Amino acid sequence: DGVGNASGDWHCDSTWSEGRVTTTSTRTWVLPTYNNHLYLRIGTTANSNTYNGFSTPWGYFDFNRFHCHFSPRDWQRLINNNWGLRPKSMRVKIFNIQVKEVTTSNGETTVANNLTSTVQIFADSTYELPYVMDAGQEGSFPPFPNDVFMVPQYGYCGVVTGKNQNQTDRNAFYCLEYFPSQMLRTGNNFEVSYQFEKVPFHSMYAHSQSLDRMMNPLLDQYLWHLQSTTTGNSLNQGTATTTYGKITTGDFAYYRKNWLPGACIKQQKFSKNANQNYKIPASGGDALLKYDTHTTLNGRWSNMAPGPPMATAGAGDSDFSNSQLIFAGPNPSGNTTTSSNNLLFTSEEEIATTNPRDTDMFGQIADNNQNATTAPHIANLDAMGIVPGMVWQNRDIYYQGPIWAKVPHTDGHFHPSPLMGGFGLKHPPPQIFIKNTPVPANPNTTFSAARINSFLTQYSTGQVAVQIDWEIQKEHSKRWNPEVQFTSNYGTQNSMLWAPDNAGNYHELRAIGSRFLTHHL
Amino acid sequence: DGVGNASGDWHCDSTWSEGRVTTTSTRTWVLPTYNNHLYLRIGTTANSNTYNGFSTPWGYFDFNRFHCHFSPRDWQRLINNNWGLRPKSMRVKIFNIQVKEVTTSNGETTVANNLTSTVQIFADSTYELPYVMDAGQEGSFPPFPNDVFMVPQYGYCGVVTGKNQNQTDRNAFYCLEYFPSQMLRTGNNFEVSYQFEKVPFHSMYAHSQSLDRMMNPLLDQYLWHLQSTTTGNSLNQGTATTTYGKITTGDFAYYRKNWLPGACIKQQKFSKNANQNYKIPASGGDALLKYDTHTTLNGRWSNMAPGPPMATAGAGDSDFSNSQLIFAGPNPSGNTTTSSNNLLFTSEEEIATTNPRDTDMFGQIADNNQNATTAPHIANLDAMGIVPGMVWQNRDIYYQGPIWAKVPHTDGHFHPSPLMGGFGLKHPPPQIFIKNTPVPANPNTTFSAARINSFLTQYSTGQVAVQIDWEIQKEHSKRWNPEVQFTSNYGTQNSMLWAPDNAGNYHELRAIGSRFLTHHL
Amino acid sequence: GACIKQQKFSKNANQNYKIPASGGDALLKYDTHTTLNGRWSNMAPGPPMATA
Amino acid sequence: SLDRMMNPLLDQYLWHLQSTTTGNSLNQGTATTTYGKITTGDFAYYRKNWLP
Amino acid sequence: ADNNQNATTAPHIANLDAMGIVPGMVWQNRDIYYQGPIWAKVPHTDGHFHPS
Amino acid sequence: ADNNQNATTAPHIANLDAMGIVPGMVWQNRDIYYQGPIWAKVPHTDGHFHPS
Amino acid sequence: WEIQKEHSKRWNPEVQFTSNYGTQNSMLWAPDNAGNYHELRAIGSRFLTHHL
Amino acid sequence: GVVTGKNQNQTDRNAFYCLEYFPSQMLRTGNNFEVSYQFEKVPFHSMYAHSQ
């Protein structure tokens, strides 16, 4: 419409109904000019870290993280009362757009409105561009609604061939100006809608049974087993006798079972105490990248973090592995710290019921055939892939964690649940790209065929609103005794948690999982 | 609509009809940026003065005071002609909104219009936020229609636990961006309507009878009483005789009565003459807070001011108590004065008919059982709560006084009439919040996930209009002789009262109650 | 329920202390009374209470 | 809290007697009636609509 | 009980001679008499409590 | 404050141990407990106050 | 039973009634070794908060 | 229920189940009980051995 009419309103809510919750988030954004209106190819040849790609002039909106859409109170209502969650529909608006001229004259900068400038926006619905939004990276909305955020710069990668960055004929370039975009002046606004595909509910419960205890404790099995090959308590001694017995109540380690625990790949275990670790450098041939479990893709090492879902240490335990996601509090300065008290540790220990431990093993296998002259021998199974009859539990979603990931486009995949948590989606929520339209500066009055390198310095601000419809399963359980609940236990504090501080800073001092309520196997 | 079209008009009126008066007030406001767009938690640990809470970036409109809605002539028409008053409906408009850029270059500031900036507005109709508007505080509209006022900054408190400010798990934080707001550019306007719940009329009359004189002076009672236990005029002397008599006309202190005066809690009495007071310091262990009647809430002292409704001294009397509200004239400088001539004293003395005096007592009680060997003894009743059969009169409303208060949300309450005067309301007129939308400054051209700390300096101005429908009860009394009226008695003046002065200042030099007309019990 | 104590008198003259009808010691003083604008009023009957 | 229901950022327009004397001590100093506006930060002195 | 007792402080009690109404009280009105008044006019006032 | 101070009379305060309800009070009821009673019968009486 | 759901706009998390009991030889709120059912805590109803 | 480590002690995640907390039919000698069920679609078991 006009320059003096607002093209949208501020909406932040959570609306709760039966089997349904709708969240709406509104933020203020600022968009700079990226790469001085240029596409730049980027890439470094650095062993395993070798990459190549392009940084675009464009930018994109990332809401992918849960604390974007929920207050800490709403996250509490969700995880205390409900067994399951999943997204249903989505709507995004971009409005109240303001383009700013910035001028420097005497050495000090002034800002004015440019009323005739445009900003370009398009959503990629058909996924024709590389999808970077699921990578677990910064640029998501700030969790606190009053904070203003910079729109992140868009860029992508391409095939790395070996450890060298040089491109081959299979590398692709993508110009985003080669897409239809809407162009918006201050009166214009943008809107797009999306439908989530049907996906299994996330499990917001922990199991109240163990996979190996699923039996009736009062009863014997009708199955029989070999109890011993000899009399007495000692190995390689006594009389050789095959002793069979009915499998009685009270020895439940010997019970025949229908199901097996899930897959495992062992992780290296580290201590939060510096004195209990061996001394492993960050770089060199002995670098810690070497001694963590890694995968090799085309000759390059990649840390297997988090990896397949596995039980891990408690968040307050001394030991930890790469199977645990780590978040930071405010206290660190400069992206490095020597103290674990400044970090937020994630624990999967809830799934220790159905899942093998991350740092222990799947089990121990008998690797020979014993006989009268051959003693039995066992080896550890450190990594055991999936076998018929296994059941397992996924990693938990976190309030600081990602909501979804895009299932890679491949003909094979197995159990397409993202390993950092959340909802695997063949077609995920689309990326919405935004750039400032270049405004040339004062040109030469004689013609040149050279491209224009000279531009007015500009940036834009505006409002973005995301609405997500969530489907929730309420807990119907018949458990008699009270559940674990997520509560505020923090006690007496100089400054409230989950609130702004003395100086106006909003920090998240805890990591909150979704698993409080329980369910039986 | 547009930038060149006004979105509202100036309306200031009082419209008088039968049983009805409608007031309309229009003011010009200015809204700054508060806390540099931040939420700040605030709190000091100071014994009884310990508090905690948050100051918001937002602001809110307060019309709660009577001189906002009435001219001194309209207040006169009301209180001379009418026995009763109460609000009925309300409508608020906010319009003609102007956002200003302010720039500093050479050391001197310039102001320009920013046509694309917005201001955010919402009314909290469902009372989900702490209601601060009834607290008897500054930020109400100026009584004089030509004056421009700053919009007050919004903030709230929370539970104080003991005398320490530290928060517990019961303290709540409130983000106002977590509410749906309308966003307004210069062409946009805002409107909201409200209905008052049914409330008893305020009594604009004083009683022309005394609670203890309600009898017929010409007649005896048929009741009998014990006149004396002895002959003669002296205590503990004479012959012991039980003497009974009919209760005759002319002794009206002995008459049996159906009703009792209201409740009392004694106040300390102070003199406006410095030499007639004992010397009581402002601070220390002997501080005046100690020797005023106070209440203890969770260990903290609070002055009981005004307290329950009680008769008090005349506004021109030497003595005064905390039961009297005090207003200031212009003369004081620096929020302190040693002279009472600069203040406006409020008097409740009209209610001395039905109410016990604030500084005297409810009465005197017989605290023993006398007998031949035991002399009778009496004690003062300083504080007597309500007993069946009491009747009382509320504190009066003042032209400088608050119109309403929000009845606290609690399961018990008794006679929910605000103690500073006015209309107790379960659902009061809503708070209407307003803030300037942050406009980021020139950002960095490389991405950072840090929040934006850099902002264009802005403020907004505009117009606000409040319309209240009032219901009034006209006086029908059969009194033969003339009433007391509120009049201009001021005599010959160098400068008119209730008018601007030589230099253009508008001051209120008197405090005007509502009680002039009389009514019989 | 609520209470405000009353002075108790005997119908037997010898069991009462000697209280005159008038004066500064007058019986109006030693009965429970209320003060309204400085005046004493006997609190008779007063709030409902069990009695003899 | 019932006694904190106010806005912590704002003063009342009400005035009160702060002290009857100069100095920090009882029964000492010069006898002076000192009045002041009731400022933000002393919330024990605020006039209130409700009682516990 | 008007104090707080402790190992060094003996407990002390005072009489409640006049106690106003508190939440949870129940009471009975005075009786009507054959020689007594039938009605009274409730005073015209904005407050009153249990207008019997 | 149980007296009236003056130049020759120091101020004096007493404790209010029992204070009945006065106009303008607000209060909160006792909480219900999982081991606690659900209801009570309001006594049959002509007066009662806040029958919780 | 009729229940009112909490609609509050509080940003930060509430206090909740939870099982905090930790590691136990015998579960609380469950029968014991010998078949006895005991209640080892007293549970009020007040966890959630509301502003005045 | 969940075994935590090699120790039997329960944690807060252990659940108790009272079966009297379910609706039951009660039967005297003349009464009888009946219930029906539908299997979900499942692959046939293979009752053959492979000849290749």
For every residue of B140-182, DSSP letters joined together read: BPPSSTT-EEEPPEEEEE---BTTB--B-TT-----GGGS-BE
The rounded distance, in Å, linking the Cα atoms of A21 and A88 is: 10
The rounded distance, in Å, linking the Cα atoms of B276 and B262 is: 30
Coil, strand or helix at A36: helix
The rounded distance, in Å, linking the Cα atoms of A513 and C51 is: 68
Chain C contact set for F47 (CB, 8 A): 1, 48
The rounded distance, in Å, linking the Cα atoms of A454 and A37 is: 10
Are A148 and A463 spatial neighbours (Cβ–Cβ below 8 Å)? no
Q: Which residues pair with B243 in a beta bridge?
A: B228
- Which of A110, A145, A489 shows the shortest C-beta gap to B175? A145
Are A521 and A353 spatial neighbours (Cβ–Cβ below 8 Å)? yes
Chain length of chain H: 52
Are A434 and A94 spatial neighbours (Cβ–Cβ below 8 Å)? yes
DSSP state of A510: S
Are F16 and E14 spatial neighbours (Cβ–Cβ below 8 Å)? no
Coil, strand or helix at A306: coil
Q: Where do we find the tokens 């709760």?
A: A16
Report residue A87 as tokens: 């997204």
DSSP state of G28: T
Show me where chain E is broken: residue before each gap, C-N > 2.5 A.
none
The rounded distance, in Å, linking the Cα atoms of B46 and B62 is: 29
Contact A481 G28 (CB under 8 A): yes
Chains F and D touch (3+ CB pairs under 8 A): yes
- Nearest residue to B179 via CA among A12, A184, A33, A277: A12
Q: Which chains touch E (3 or more CB pairs under 8 A)?
A: B, C, F
Chain G contact set for A493 (CB, 8 A): none
Are B154 and B85 spatial neighbours (Cβ–Cβ below 8 Å)? no
CA B130, distance to chain mean position in Å, is 18
DSSP notation for A256-284: --S-EE--EE----EESSGGGS----SSS
DSSP state of D45: S
Q: What totals of helices (H) and strands (E) does chain D contain, helices first?
A: 0, 2
Q: Which residues pair with B21 in a beta bridge?
A: B16, B470
Cα-Cα-Cα-Cα dihedral sign, residues A419, A422, A428, A429: negative
Chain H contact set for G22 (CB, 8 A): 11-12
Are B141 and B127 spatial neighbours (Cβ–Cβ below 8 Å)? no
Chain F contact set for B383 (CB, 8 A): 16, 19
The rounded distance, in Å, linking the Cα atoms of B79 and B518 is: 11
Contact C1 E27 (CB under 8 A): yes
**Bridging pattern class, strands B378-381 and B363-366:** antiparallel
The rounded distance, in Å, linking the Cα atoms of B287 and A72 is: 44
**Bridging pattern class, strands B458-474 and B82-104:** antiparallel
Coil, strand or helix at B26: strand
**Bridging pattern class, strands B153-157 and B51-60:** antiparallel
Helix, strand, coil shares of chain B, percent, nearest 5, are 10, 35, 55
The rounded distance, in Å, linking the Cα atoms of B46 and A158 is: 63
Find the residue in D nearest to F26 (Cα).
Answer: D52
Chain F contact set for B301 (CB, 8 A): none
- Which of F10, F22, F26 shows the shortest C-beta gap to D2? F26
User: How many CB pairs below 8 A link D and G?
Assistant: 3
End-to-end CA distance of chain C: 17
H/E segment holding residue B202? strand B202-203
Kindly give, in sequence order, each residue whose CB lies less than 8 Å from that of residue H22, ignoring residues fewer than 6 positions away: A478
Contact B135 D6 (CB under 8 A): yes
Chains A and B touch (3+ CB pairs under 8 A): yes
Report residue A472 as tokens: 């929730």
The rounded distance, in Å, linking the Cα atoms of A486 and G46 is: 16
Largest CA distance in chain G: 48
Report residue B316 as tokens: 């021109």
Find the residue in G nearest to A78 (Cα).
Answer: G13
Contact A483 G19 (CB under 8 A): yes
Q: What angle do CA B200, B195, B67 make, to 5 degrees?
A: 70
Chain B contact set for F46 (CB, 8 A): none
Kindly give, in sequence order, each residue whose CB lies less than 8 Å from that of residue B351, ignoring residues fewer than 6 positions away: B206, B207, B309, B310, B311, B392, B393, B394, B395, B396
Contact E20 C2 (CB under 8 A): yes
DSSP state of F25: B
Chain E contact set for F21 (CB, 8 A): 20-23
Instruction: Write down the H helix ranges in A245-369.
Output: 288-291
Are A19 and A471 spatial neighbours (Cβ–Cβ below 8 Å)? yes
Choose, out of A110, A148, A487, the residue to mutate when testing the contact with B (most B CBs < 10 Å): A148
**Residues of G at the H interface (Cβ-Cβ below 8 Å)?**
18-27, 29-31
Find the residue in D nearest to F19 (Cα).
Answer: D52
The rounded distance, in Å, linking the Cα atoms of B207 and D28 is: 44
The rounded distance, in Å, linking the Cα atoms of A395 and A324 is: 10
This entry's atomic model was obtained through cryo-EM
DSSP notation for A83-115: EEEEEEEEEEEEEEEEEEEEEESSSSEEEEE-T
- Nearest residue to A512 via CA among A492, A494, A487, A480: A487
- Which of B36, B169, B181 shows the shortest C-beta gap to A488? B169
Kindly give, in sequence order, each residue whose CB lies less than 8 Å from that of residue A300, ignoring residues fewer than 6 positions away: A47, A48, A50, A160, A163
The rounded distance, in Å, linking the Cα atoms of B438 and H20 is: 61
DSSP state of D40: T
Q: How far is CA A29 from CA A26, B38, B224, in A?
A: 10, 16, 87
Residue B16: exposure state from Cβ atoms within 10 A (0-12, 13-18, ≥19): middle
Which regions of A404-457 does DSSP assign to beta strands (E)?
404-406, 423-425, 431-436
DSSP notation for B397-436: PBTTSB-EEEPPS-SEESS---TTSSEEESS-SPEEEEEE
Find the residue in G nearest to D1 (Cα).
Answer: G52
- Residue type at A147 in one-letter notation: D
Report residue A282 as tokens: 């960050």
Are B119 and B99 spatial neighbours (Cβ–Cβ below 8 Å)? yes
Q: How far is CA B308 from CA B245, B394, D13, E24, F12, in A?
A: 38, 9, 20, 21, 21
Q: Which chains touch F (3 or more CB pairs under 8 A)?
A: B, C, D, E, G
Kindly give, in sequence order, each residue whose CB lies less than 8 Å from that of residue G19, ignoring residues fewer than 6 positions away: A481, A482, A483, A484, A485, G28, G29, H12
Instruction: Write down the H helix ranges in C1-52.
Output: 27-30
Which regions of A307-359 does DSSP assign to beta strands (E)?
319-320, 326-328, 343-345
Least Cα separation, residue G41 to chain F (angstroms): 9
Are A483 and G19 spatial neighbours (Cβ–Cβ below 8 Å)? yes
Kindly give, in sequence order, each residue whose CB lies less than 8 Å from that of residue C16, ignoring residues fewer than 6 positions away: B229, B230, B240, B242, B370, B371, B372, C9, C10
Helix, strand, coil shares of chain E, percent, nearest 5, are 0, 15, 85
DSSP state of C33: E
Q: What angle do CA A407, A412, A414 make, to 5 degrees?
A: 65
End-to-end CA distance of chain B: 58
DSSP notation for B97-126: EEEEEEEESSSSEEEEE-TT--EEEEEESS
**Bridging pattern class, strands B51-60 and B40-44:** antiparallel
- Nearest residue to B400 via CA among B345, B323, B338: B345
Coil, strand or helix at F11: coil
Coil, strand or helix at A190: strand
Find the residue in E nearest to F20 (Cα).
Answer: E20
Kindly give, in sequence order, each residue whose CB lies less than 8 Å from that of residue B433, ignoring residues fewer than 6 positions away: B58, B59, B60, B120, B121, B122, B123, B124, B154, B176, B181
H/E segment holding residue B77? helix B72-81
Give exposure, A361-376, as e/b (b: 16+ Cβ within 10 Å).
bbeeeeeeeeeeeeee
Least Cα separation, residue C50 to chain E (angstroms): 9
- Which of A2, A9, A504 shows the shortest C-beta gap to B35? A504
Which regions of chain C does DSSP assign to beta strands (E)?
3-4, 33-36, 39-42
Chain G contact set for B173 (CB, 8 A): 10-12
Report residue B152 as tokens: 């007050």
- Nearest residue to B382 via CA among B253, B293, B318, B286: B293
> Cβ of B430: how many Cβ atoms within 10 Å?
20
User: How many CB pairs below 8 A link D and F?
Assistant: 15
Give exposure, A480-515, as e/b (b: 16+ Cβ within 10 Å).
ebbbbbbbbebeeeebbbbbbbeebebbbebbbbbb
Residue F48 has φ and ψ, to the nearest 5°, of: -160, 160
Documented resolution in Å: 2.5
- Nearest residue to B7 via CA among B123, B97, B112, B120: B97
Q: Which residues pair with A300 in a beta bridge?
A: A297
CA A175, distance to chain mean position in Å, is 28
- Residue type at A446 in one-letter notation: T
Are B303 and B322 spatial neighbours (Cβ–Cβ below 8 Å)? yes
Q: Where do we find the tokens 């009888």?
A: H32
Report residue A9 as tokens: 């309103």
**Bridging pattern class, strands B404-406 and B423-425:** parallel
- Nearest residue to A130 via CA among A163, A173, A90: A173
Choose, out of G16, G19, G23, the residue to mutate when testing the contact with H (most H CBs < 10 Å): G23
DSSP state of A176: G
Are D24 and B283 spatial neighbours (Cβ–Cβ below 8 Å)? yes
B275 Rama class: left (phi>0) / alpha (psi -120 to 50) / beta: alpha
Evaluate the omega torsion of the peptide bond into residue B306 and state whether it is cis, within 30 degrees of 0: yes
* A244-250: long-range contacts, CB 8 A cutoff, minimum separation 24: A246/A220, A246/A221, A246/A222, A247/A220, A247/A221, A247/A223, A248/A220, A249/A217, A249/A218, A249/A219, A249/A220
Instruction: Write down the H helix ranges in B13-63.
Output: none
Q: Where do we find the tokens 């009471």?
A: E27
Kindly give, in sequence order, each residue whose CB lies less than 8 Å from that of residue A263, ignoring residues fewer than 6 positions away: A308, A356, A362, A384, A385, A386, A390, A392
Are G51 and B409 spatial neighbours (Cβ–Cβ below 8 Å)? yes
Kindly give, in sequence order, each residue whose CB lies less than 8 Å from that of residue G21, ignoring residues fewer than 6 positions away: G28, H12
The rounded distance, in Å, linking the Cα atoms of B491 and B210 is: 33
Coil, strand or helix at E35: coil
Coil, strand or helix at A35: helix
Q: Where do we find the tokens 């030693």?
A: C30
The rounded distance, in Å, linking the Cα atoms of F27 and B408 is: 9
- Which of E16, E19, E30 shows the shortest C-beta gap to C48? E30
The rounded distance, in Å, linking the Cα atoms of A461 and A480 is: 54
**Bridging pattern class, strands B109-113 and B82-104:** antiparallel
Chains D and B touch (3+ CB pairs under 8 A): yes
Report residue B237 as tokens: 């002397």
